[PDB]
Ligand binder design. Structure first.
Ligand SMILES: COc1nc(C)nc(NC(=O)NS(=O)(=O)c2ccccc2Cl)n1
Ligand SMILES: COc1nc(C)nc(NC(=O)NS(=O)(=O)c2ccccc2Cl)n1
Lengths: 201, 203
């Protein structure tokens, strides 16, 4: 009947059945309680996903708050990288986090994040869209990689010899790129744009 | 007599009815009123179905894969991202349908001409490739988040703005009233400005 045991079991079930197979019914079953028992901790699948996402980001310490002396640039880098590693620590992590939003218990943290960026000279709007850009990019990079790896198993492999010369060279790079370098390339573009943006402002 | 276009039209309607998770070739054949081998000639499996749905969405909604005459690379990437976004938004789970795709052989000339264009404008082949991939990833991400949040919205209590701190309240107001397009355009402009900084560094 403990929140913590509910969440630990649910994380285990996530890894066993993935996000699409997860239900409150199967969690009640794995826990051995009557639906209304579970209901009081987790009212529906959506609330279960929301709780799972809070737990993942908490336990992997997604970097929501800047350290003293941390530049805004490094702060956004650390936020992205730590979020990414939190998402990659659980089956369908990115999918679980895709639908989340700040809970009331997180409003102080969220406010402090925006306060930090606006203290650097970003407008509220720009601080907001910066954080959102880093979030959606990070989600997109993880989700695209995951799905590309499934998809290439359900389709004939491409034939390199059929590729015209630039594309062939492109193909060869991407064979070797790795997920983390793709992610970091985009991340750095975003940070560099924000710097330019902050100067102009 | 079943034509490919009918398969695709009907599959796009079924996508809207049941979503990407619920879409199956069995349900499509039932919808078309045909036996399973008749459909199979057109789409061998669910992956082939998604591949063909993505191609149709991007074709119909005129995703900007080809630069205009005299178009700058900046305007090219803006138009690519924006048009791709609207294509993904045209159908339920549209971003998820495009998420697993890759160039087909029939698109290799398109993809070549895109790399030729970007290198002509002064990018290395490597940075031309990674630029396009970063814009694509950002655009998929934005629409993934938009479409999932649309569903999530109806499965939980709505927040209470009056209990929010000042800056977060201002943020909430912005997102509720301006919707997802300004946030998307902001991030796109960041990527373009980052790419300009990259050309300067490689000067
Ligand atoms: C940027 O990381 C992050 N993480 C979460 C969990 N949510 C958000 N943004 C968010 O929730 N935005 S919102 O528009 O849905 C919102 C909800 C409640 C209060 C304020 C706001 Cl802006 N970003
Ligand atoms: C940039 O928009 C876009 N659209 C599609 C459909 N695919 C891609 N990229 C892509 O397919 N990359 S790839 O590495 O899997 C590839 C496959 C075949 C030949 C070359 C390459 Cl690079 N981008």
């Amino acid at each position: 009947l403990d929140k913590s045991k509910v969440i630990n079991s649910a994380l285990e079930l996530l890894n066993e059945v993935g996000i699409e197979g997860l239900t409150t019914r199967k969690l009640a079953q794995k826990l051995g309680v009557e639906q209304p028992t579970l209901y009081w901790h987790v009212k529906n699948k959506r609330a279960l996903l929301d709780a799972l996402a809070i737990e993942m980001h908490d336990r992997h310490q997604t970097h929501y708050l800047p350290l003293e002396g941390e530049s805004w640039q490094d702060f956004l880098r650390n936020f992205a990288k730590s979020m990414r590693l939190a998402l990659l620590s659980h089956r369908d992590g990115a999918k679980v986090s895709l639908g989340t939003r700040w809970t009331e218990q997180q409003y102080e943290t969220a406010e402090n994040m925006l306060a930090f960026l606006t203290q650097q000279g970003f407008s509220l709007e720009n601080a907001l869209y910066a954080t959102d850009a880093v979030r959606v990019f990070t989600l997109g990079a993880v989700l695209l990689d995951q799905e590309q790896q499934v998809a290439k198993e359900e389709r004939e492999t491409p034939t390199p010899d059929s590729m015209p010369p630039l594309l062939r060279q492109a193909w060869e790079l991407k064979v070797h790129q790795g997920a983390e370098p793709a992610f970091l390339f985009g991340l750095e573009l975003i940070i560099a744009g924000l710097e330019k943006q902050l100067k102009r402002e």
